[PDB]
Design a protein around this ligand. Structure first.
Ligand code: CA
Ligand code: CA
Ligand code: CA
Ligand code: CA
Lengths: 23, 134
């Protein structure tokens, strides 16, 4: 369940992708 | 530890067709559903920065290696708060979660209550950060 862990995961992973892109 | 269980799930939210790998398209769509507009070039730079093999896709082991703030969230909030009034209603919460990857009002109203600190029935920014910063 937890639709929130899902949203959080997506958001946080997209942020890490943006990061590796900048590093 | 088996927190590889949370990354595996995160990986599955991206690996939509569940073929074991994340592609450029499959990455762009998730990033778009979250309010971003990356270019095709940015979609290959990011993959190649994680893609150690030389394929063009990211498999789970590679994803794990990579997996081991305000604006991204303030930007997510705005995707949720569709009418920009500072509050995520139950309707907006449905609309956005079904756009993020999901099909009830018991499921949506449970979500609200799980983060509704002040109890007004909707989700504001402060309450939003709580569920995003674990
Ligand atoms: Ca896939
Ligand atoms: Ca690869
Ligand atoms: Ca609203
Ligand atoms: Ca509230």
């Amino acid at each position: 369940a937890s639709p929130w862990k899902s949203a959080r995961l997506m958001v946080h992973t997209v942020a890490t992708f943006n990061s590796i892109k900048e590093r | 530890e088996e927190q590889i269980a949370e990354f595996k799930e995160a990986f599955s939210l991206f690996d939509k067709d569940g073929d074991g790998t994340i592609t450029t398209k499959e990455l762009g769509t998730v990033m778009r559903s979250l309010g971003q507009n990356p270019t095709e070039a940015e979609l290959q730079d990011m993959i190649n920065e994680v893609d150690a093999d030389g394929n063009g896709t990211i498999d789970f082991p590679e994803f794990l290696t990579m997996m081991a703030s305000e604006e991204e969230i303030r930007e997510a909030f705005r995707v949720f708060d569709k009418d920009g009034n500072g509050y995520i209603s139950a309707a907006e919460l449905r609309h956005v979660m079904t756009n993020l990857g999901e099909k009830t009002d018991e499921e949506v109203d449970e979500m609200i209550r799980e983060a509704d600190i002040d109890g007004d029935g909707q989700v504001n920014y402060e309450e939003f950060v709580q569920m995003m910063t674990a």
